[PDB]
């Protein structure tokens, strides 16, 4: 079935809890450090930390102020 993602905002001039303007979350990113190593061709790599998205973003309804 469909995602049914929003858990509804918690809490003319009609304040129904759902149907707020939607917003998207921020993807989660994680960094790994690679120790130096030697290639098959004898090229020495001393690389750097790689930051990559791990968790993506999703839709969410902001809590009304």
């Amino acid at each position: 079935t469909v995602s049914t993602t929003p858990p509804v905002s918690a809490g003319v001039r009609c304040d129904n809890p759902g149907t707020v303007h939607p917003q998207r979350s921020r993807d989660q990113i994680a960094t790994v450090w690679i120790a130096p190593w030697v290639d098959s061709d004898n090229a020495f790599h001393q690389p750097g930390r790689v930051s990559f998205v791990v968790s993506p973003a999703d839709w969410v309804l902001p809590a009304r102020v």
């Binding site: 994680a30 960094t31 790994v32 450090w33 690679i34 120790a35 190593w37 290639d39 790599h45 690389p47 930390r49 790689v50 990559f52 791990v54």
Partner: protein
């Protein structure tokens, strides 16, 4: 010199002088001229150059209108006044770009690097790749800057690599900047920190996944 660049909307009309004595060129970058039309007798010879473009010569002495049609469906018009001099070259541009091709990342990382990255991501989420059956972790893996106590939580062992998770204790009371290479031990392939490091404070328990070779001592 550089070719004179002219930007025109479709059906656009630009007044540019050409030459009676010498050959003249009109090229649209990224486009191939498929057709050219001029009042009769005005253009003596028309040839298609390499990579599109038209080479044309005029014996005429009267201002005239040339219509050029490209292969992407664009048609432009030029009013040409023939005058004595060097052959003139014009670069035809489109005022409105029709489409935006999406960027292409062609760079490819090394096989070893991708292998470590894939595993680190799998461990972070917790799903297990095939051939990883779980194992007791060691105590050999982590060197401690100070104020840190290590407890093993979970660990996976496979056919080529091995991963484990240790939770460090909160450090004393001085802020301890966390350096990912300050927990290194011979034999470890990659070390990564959960969350974002940036100084564990007067405390905090942060899980660290350490990656080491498998089978090799």
């Amino acid at each position: 010199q550089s070719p004179a660049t002219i930007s025109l909307p479709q059906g656009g009309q630009f007044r540019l002088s050409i030459s009676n004595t010498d050959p003249n060129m009109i090229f649209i970058p990224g486009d191939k001229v498929t057709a050219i039309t001029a009042p009769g007798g005005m253009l003596a010879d028309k040839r298609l150059t390499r990579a599109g473009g038209v080479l044309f010569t005029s014996v005429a002495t009267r201002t005239f209108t040339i219509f050029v049609e490209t292969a992407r469906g664009q048609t432009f018009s030029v009013v040409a006044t023939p005058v004595k001099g060097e052959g003139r070259v014009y670069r035809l541009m489109s005022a409105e770009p029709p489409s935006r091709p999406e960027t292409r990342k062609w760079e490819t990382a090394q096989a070893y690097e991708k292998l470590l990255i894939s595993l680190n991501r799998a461990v972070l989420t917790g799903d297990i790749p095939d051939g990883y059956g779980e194992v007791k972790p060691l105590s050999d893996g982590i060197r401690l800057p100070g104020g840190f106590s290590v407890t093993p939580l979970k660990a996976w062992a496979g056919d080529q690599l091995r991963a484990d998770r240790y939770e460090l204790r909160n450090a004393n009371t001085w802020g301890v900047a966390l350096r990912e290479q300050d927990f290194w031990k011979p034999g470890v392939r990659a070390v990564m920190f959960d969350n974002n490091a940036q100084t564990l404070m007067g405390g905090g328990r942060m899980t660290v996944t350490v990656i080491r070779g498998n089978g090799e001592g």
